[PDB]
Amino acid sequence: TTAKRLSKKEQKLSSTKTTVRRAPFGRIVRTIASLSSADSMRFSANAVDLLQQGIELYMLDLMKNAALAAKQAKRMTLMGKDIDLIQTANHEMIDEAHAAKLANTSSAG
Amino acid sequence: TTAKRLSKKEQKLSSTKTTVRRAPFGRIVRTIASLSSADSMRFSANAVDLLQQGIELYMLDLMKNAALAAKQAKRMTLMGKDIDLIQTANHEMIDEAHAAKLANTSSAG
Amino acid sequence: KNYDSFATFIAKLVGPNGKGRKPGFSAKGMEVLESIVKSLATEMTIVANELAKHQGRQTLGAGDFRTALAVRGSLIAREPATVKALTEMGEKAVLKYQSSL
Amino acid sequence: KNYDSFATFIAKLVGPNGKGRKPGFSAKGMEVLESIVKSLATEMTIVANELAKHQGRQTLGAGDFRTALAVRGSLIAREPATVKALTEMGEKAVLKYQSSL
Amino acid sequence: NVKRANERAGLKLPPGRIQKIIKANQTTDVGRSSPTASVFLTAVIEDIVKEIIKGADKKSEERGRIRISPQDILKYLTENGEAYMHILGDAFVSHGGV
Amino acid sequence: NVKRANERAGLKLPPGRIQKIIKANQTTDVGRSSPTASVFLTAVIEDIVKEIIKGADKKSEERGRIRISPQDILKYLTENGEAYMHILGDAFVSHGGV
Amino acid sequence: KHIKNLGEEIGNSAVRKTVLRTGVVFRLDKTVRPKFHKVMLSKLYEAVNIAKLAAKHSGRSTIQPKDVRLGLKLASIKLLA
Amino acid sequence: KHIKNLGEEIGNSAVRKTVLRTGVVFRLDKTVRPKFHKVMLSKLYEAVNIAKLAAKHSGRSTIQPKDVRLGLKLASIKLLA
DNA sequence: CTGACACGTGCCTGGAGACTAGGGAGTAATCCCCTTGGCGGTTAAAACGCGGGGGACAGCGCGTACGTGCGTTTAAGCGGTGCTAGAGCTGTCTACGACCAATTGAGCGGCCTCGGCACCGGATTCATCG
DNA sequence: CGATGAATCCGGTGCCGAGGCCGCTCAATTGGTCGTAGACAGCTCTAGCACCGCTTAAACGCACGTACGCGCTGTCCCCCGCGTTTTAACCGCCAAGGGGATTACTCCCTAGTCTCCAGGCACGTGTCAG
């Protein structure tokens, strides 16, 4: 039940904390902005904090829906083939080759 | 292998004839137009066809998604609880009460 | 040059309280409570303007907005009281304003 | 007296008898072939006006449409393969009429 | 001077500020915008805001403290009083938890 | 005269009719709308529609006939040439197969 | 004639036809029908009353293609394109 | 080698915290982690490059809060309300 | 705790009378297109009883594959410092959209014809359970 | 080793849509300014970027054992199949009148300019609330 105990405090931490730390967000954001061009986009100090509060909540909602779908199948755990079903049920078209190229090959730094 | 042939015929040959005939559709549309009002609203001759072409094509996508979910759940038939998952994952929750008065209390046309 | 916002006016709503006290607030919730107003205003104004173009008119007042509120109530399937009280209040306010002509 | 429809022009663009088959057209083909143009010219101009308003301008001199077409080709994960060709075609057309003055 | 807009319709928020927002989004086929639409819109918005604040304040005290926080807005009055919630659409309030 | 503005810019559709619908959504505060906006949009739309028509014509003759119908546009071509389909992702078109 | 109440005007065979138009699942249980009826009527009620209100706002009494087109557009269902 | 390869900076801990943040499912298999990263990065790219284009179109070379607030709205994801 | 918001103050420009032109919305008048409605005669489709079978739910066995505790890194993170790209406001000259005559042909609305597709009737692949 | 219901293909038919005319009546040019908007050179001061040293939370990898996903099998019940009966689309035809659509007109309530003063915006300040 350690998972249950940690999930008890996870919401209370969520009221003030973030899932991925600030510097690993500043990088990632800067690296992606630097693509599709050849210039340093020179972000501000509040755009990153505005982006985080949207993306993290969006994916919290997505995984909540996916876990709800997984429970319905009388399966306790969560599998990847549950996400694709939710994504295609929301008509959210995606590209797989581009996503694989983005995730696999980069340097960030 | 009778349902397979029935589906093969329905998919191709019947690309014009709708699932529900025109006269019952007109009767239900006229009955629902006078709900929550105090005047016989009349209609036109080309609006009902547009309403049909909208509603039926809207329901077909939802049923395709629900059937895909049911097949993904390692099942062969289809159950009503499959539709509820898609309805929740796509938002727009229905007031359970209204649909009942609509299907049950409403009785005319 | 000044900036125009509802930061003070949001703090100006009903706070005098004798039976419940608590006329409190904070600066963390100011941003969300002032974005709510802008969101509602834009959302209903868009629908009122779109509904106006049907009639061929080019004027908005006490009409198109009321029908926009009714449409945003019907689309939500809200409880009848939520939209009924709001529209009755709006009619009362417009009557109070137009009493003095 | 006069109307707004593209039937004559829609039934004209493709050069007939490519191999000996002039493009025929049904009654219901026209409805979809005009609705596509309507929808495209509506959404693209909406996203090209909401960006010129963001900049703080008054004129849409086709430089506020290039970055709307690019936005609409990036939002749909559509690779620039068939967006750069359209952009080049549009830029070539713009110069054609402009130079004639 | 009638610039005492608060006592004109008994409201609080200044109708003018809402009117500029109204005039911001209007396709170039309307213009006009009679001044009696702003009063209607401002009254509706004022009632909504007053009700949500009144509802959230009482519960934001039981948890402790005497202020109003984004979590103390998302909880209860948005989750309990969903009538003033479904009208806007999504919630996505803030760092307010679940 | 350069009444052949279609010939002036090498187009087929009349730019004025596209400008009529361009101006329908200007949300005020902008106005103006220089005439160079219509030519670019008209050229792009003309290329799109020409490609769609050419493909649908090429692929309709496999079933036979000399007509283009919603069944020959929704299915057959758009599910094959999805590049011009995704840009208007909400197909839901007409009496067609899939 | 004996039973005229709403819902069954959408025939029992209509559900089979619309679920068989897609070649994924060829069977359905007893509880699928009421969910279909409730969903379809819940959508249609809003999609028709929006058009009725938009028609009545501009005077007139008879609904017309423009009004139903606007209602469909506002009901988050996007027509031919 | 290390080269801070992209996507791993959203470590397994972030995915686990996101999954356990809700209280319905307390387990996750090995297929979830490689899917979460690719689900996130596409959305982040499609919501960042739009704001970059909007920032470049208005002169300038730096991104401000209004640009990203416009990009989030355009990316079909609503914000605080 | 320590710093943040509610209290207090000074100022200025934007919200207000106010008076006027000038056009758009309300409204009576008029006719003719089009919605609704009743009859009925074939005739297709939905509703219904019956039988056999395959598909959902449920136990058991199995084994590999997550969760957990523990020692070990390792970059998040603070506060400080310095350096400079670029947001932001101002002053000047001008190109190019706007509104107004005057002219003229191109596409909208009707008519006329002739084939395109819906339709049926006939000849047969694959197959198949004896 | 044949061979059911049919896997699709050939041979026409005539019944109304799509394509070729056919003048005409406004919609797209064409010239002619001109007064605001977009451009653009200069500048001044702000915040974004880059690096150092210390400390401690947090992600991280390994050993081990159990919870749980998956395949097997008996089942029994509920969905489909098929003939048959009941209903009710639906197409041809004739009324009947509601209400869409155009015109006249005239008076109200928005648009715009001229002038003023007090409400709202930007600093000190302390005392409690995270």
Side-chain angles (χ1 to χ4, degrees), chain B residues 7 14 17 27 104 106, chain G residues 5 9 20-21 35 38 61:
Chain B
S7 200
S14 279
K17 184 46 221 80
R27 271 197 320 282
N104 308 312
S106 295
Chain G
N5 186 340
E9 296 225 57
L20 205 34
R21 282 230 186 200
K35 177 68 63 157
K38 292 185 327 168
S61 168

Side-chain angles (χ1 to χ4, degrees), chain B residues 96-108:
Chain B
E96 170 63 39
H98 205 31
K101 293 179 179 179
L102 295 174
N104 308 312
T105 79
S106 295
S107 52

Side-chain angles (χ1 to χ4, degrees), chain C residues 4-38:
Chain C
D4 320 333
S5 64
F6 307 90
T8 59
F9 295 104
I10 278 154
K12 296 287 153 44
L13 287 319
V14 174
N17 195 349
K19 206 42 73 193
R21 288 48 87 197
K22 308 272 302 154
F25 217 82
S26 178
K28 266 315 296 159
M30 268 322 306
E31 228 276 313
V32 61
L33 236 266
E34 76 179 300
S35 177
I36 287 204
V37 169
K38 183 220 69 47

Side-chain angles (χ1 to χ4, degrees), chain D residues 39-61:
Chain D
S39 178
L40 261 65
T42 289
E43 321 276 0
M44 258 203 49
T45 204
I46 275 187
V47 63
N49 151 84
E50 207 99 67
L51 177 63
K53 160 143 80 56
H54 159 269
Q55 175 173 18
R57 185 182 295 276
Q58 321 243 8
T59 324
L60 316 83

Side-chain angles (χ1 to χ4, degrees), chain D residues 22-97:
Chain D
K22 169 147 116 81
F25 283 112
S26 64
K28 291 285 214 279
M30 275 331 91
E31 278 187 53
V32 303
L33 295 174
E34 309 325 310
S35 178
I36 59 173
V37 179
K38 259 256 301 180
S39 178
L40 261 65
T42 289
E43 321 276 0
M44 258 203 49
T45 204
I46 275 187
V47 63
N49 151 84
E50 207 99 67
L51 177 63
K53 160 143 80 56
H54 159 269
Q55 175 173 18
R57 185 182 295 276
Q58 321 243 8
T59 324
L60 316 83
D64 289 345
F65 262 110
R66 214 151 150 191
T67 83
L69 181 67
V71 152
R72 183 65 65 185
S74 178
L75 196 145
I76 301 295
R78 165 61 244 162
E79 210 181 25
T82 172
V83 151
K84 293 179 179 179
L86 294 200
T87 278
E88 191 259 4
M89 161 65 201
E91 204 77 49
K92 168 63 64 163
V94 160
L95 177 63
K96 282 173 97 295
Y97 112 91

